[PDB]
Amino acid sequence: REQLLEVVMEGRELRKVAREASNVINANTRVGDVPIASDEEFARPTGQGAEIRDDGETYTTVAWNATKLTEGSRVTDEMRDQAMVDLIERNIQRVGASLENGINRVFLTELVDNAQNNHDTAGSNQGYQALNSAVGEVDKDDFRPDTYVTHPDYRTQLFNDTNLAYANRAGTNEVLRNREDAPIVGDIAGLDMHAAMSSATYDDGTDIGWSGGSETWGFSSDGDKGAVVYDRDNIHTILYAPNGQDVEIKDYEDPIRDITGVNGRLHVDCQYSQGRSSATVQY
């Protein structure tokens, strides 16, 4: 009586945060514009009885062009019958996961590359003082950040900081106990959200079909960008789908060839409303 071991062991799963960590727009069109107002100015010293000169509101836009992201799979119908598990369910899960990873790559690459401020730690004081300094850099441009996005090496280094690691310095032992799941990690330097990213997420340009970003994402070597401190309301992830609100997964049979497949799609763009509202932290 040959009873098989039915279980399949999972691969590496990346962290997905872009839907929470940015303003999501569910667009009505695959291309579109967000109107931006000009900065506030100072009123003008004027002589009594003189004409008041104009300096009215002026406007521009940031455009979105939601790039179609896709992931497909095809299997011989004969194999669907012989599979140890629901092989179509597994491919649906993979296809959906590849799209969520796609969103997070578009988001993180916009976030890191187009941040207008930077704090260079010069290999020193890299924990709390770097977050506070990066908030200071955004504050000098008169925006207020509320979120930070973080690389695994930055997280690792930050939780060695005695200001977080000693219970009396943190006012709480949660960082020592529960690490990134501690409430203080999401409530630090005036920031009320932490978005833990995966290392593979940023577009290095080494992955197929992708052309890389301008920076290095990491926190291991001279010049790596390891965290971004930013205003969550000033970075937009724009999602477009023709057949609904979100990811569309379609099953199909080949009409001729006894092949079944599953295909996922979503259109996504990411754009800063105000790139000055964001600062990278650099190794």
Partner 1 sequence: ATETQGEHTFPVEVLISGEELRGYTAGEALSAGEPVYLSGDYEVSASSADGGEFLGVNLYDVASGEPVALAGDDCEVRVEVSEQVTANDEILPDGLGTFETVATSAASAGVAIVQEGAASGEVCEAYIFAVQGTTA
Partner 2 sequence: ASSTPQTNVDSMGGGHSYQFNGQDLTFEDLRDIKDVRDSGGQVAQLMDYKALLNFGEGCEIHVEGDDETKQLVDGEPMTLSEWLEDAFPHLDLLVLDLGGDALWYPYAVGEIQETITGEFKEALPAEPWTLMPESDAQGKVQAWHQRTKTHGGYQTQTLPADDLWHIVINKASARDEVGISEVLRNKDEIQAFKQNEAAINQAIELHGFPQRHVKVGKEDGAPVRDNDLRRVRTIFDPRTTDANTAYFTGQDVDVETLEAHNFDYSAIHEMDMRNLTTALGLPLEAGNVGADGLGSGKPAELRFALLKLAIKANQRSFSVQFVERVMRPVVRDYSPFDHEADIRLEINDPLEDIGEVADLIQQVGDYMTNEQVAEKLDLPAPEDDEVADSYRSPADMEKDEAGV
Partner 3 sequence: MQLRRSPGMRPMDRDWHQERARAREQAYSSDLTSQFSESEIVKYELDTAQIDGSDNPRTYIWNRTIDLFGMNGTDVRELRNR
> Where on the chain is the footprint of partner 3 (CB under 8 A)?
2, 4, 73-76, 78-79, 82-85, 87, 259, 261
Selected range binding partner 2 among 43-51, 56-64, 221-229, 242-250, rule: CB under 8 A: 242-250
Sign, CA torsion 148/154/160/162? negative
**Nearest residue (CB) to partner 2, 189 versus 200:** 200
Least distance to Mg ion, CB of residue 186, Å: 8
Q: Which does 39 bind (CB under 5 to 8 A by kind): Mg ion, partner 1, partner 3, none?
A: none
- Contact between 248 and partner 2 by CB under 8 A: the answer reads yes
Phi-psi region of 122 (alpha: psi -120 to 50; beta: other; left: phi over 0): left
Distance CA 170, CA 147 (A): 19
174-183 long-range CB contacts below 8 Å, 24 or more apart?
180/155
Least distance to partner 3, CB of residue 67, Å: 25
- Contact between 246 and partner 2 by CB under 8 A: the answer reads yes
Least distance to partner 2, CB of residue 21, Å: 16
3-state secondary structure 25-60: EECCCCEEEEEEECCCCCCCCCCCCCCCCCCCCCEE
248 is in an annotated binding site: no
- Smallest CA-to-CA distance from 158 within 133, 126, 181 is with 126
- Contact between 162 and Mg ion by CB under 5 A: the answer reads no
Distance CA 21, CA 27 (A): 18
Least distance to partner 2, CB of residue 149, Å: 21
Distance CA 109, CA 106 (A): 5
Which of 3, 28, 82, 168 contacts partner 2 by CB under 8 A?
3
Least distance to partner 3, CB of residue 259, Å: 7
- Contact between 82 and partner 2 by CB under 8 A: the answer reads no
The residues with which 61 forms a beta bridge, in sequence order, are 35
Q: What H or E segment, with its residue span, contains residue 277? A: none
What part of residues 263-282 is at the interface with partner 2 (CB under 8 A)?
264
Spatial contact of 207 and 193, defined as CB atoms under 8 Å apart: no
Selected range binding partner 2 among 40-48, 118-126, 194-202, 240-248, rule: CB under 8 A: 240-248
23 is in an annotated binding site: no
Q: Which does 12 bind (CB under 5 to 8 A by kind): Mg ion, partner 1, partner 2, none?
A: partner 1
CA dist list (Å): 249 to 89, 98, 241, 243, 261: 11, 12, 11, 10, 10
Supply 88's token pair: 């179509």
- DSSP class of residue 104? H
Selected range binding partner 2 among 86-94, 135-143, 150-158, 275-283, rule: CB under 8 A: 86-94
Q: Which does 83 bind (CB under 5 to 8 A by kind): partner 1, Mg ion, partner 3, none?
A: partner 3
Q: Which residues bind Mg ion (CB under 5 A)?
A: 33, 41, 51, 55, 63, 117, 141, 178, 187, 192
Q: Which residues bind partner 2 (CB under 8 A)?
A: 1, 3, 6-7, 89, 92-93, 95-97, 100, 243-249, 251, 264
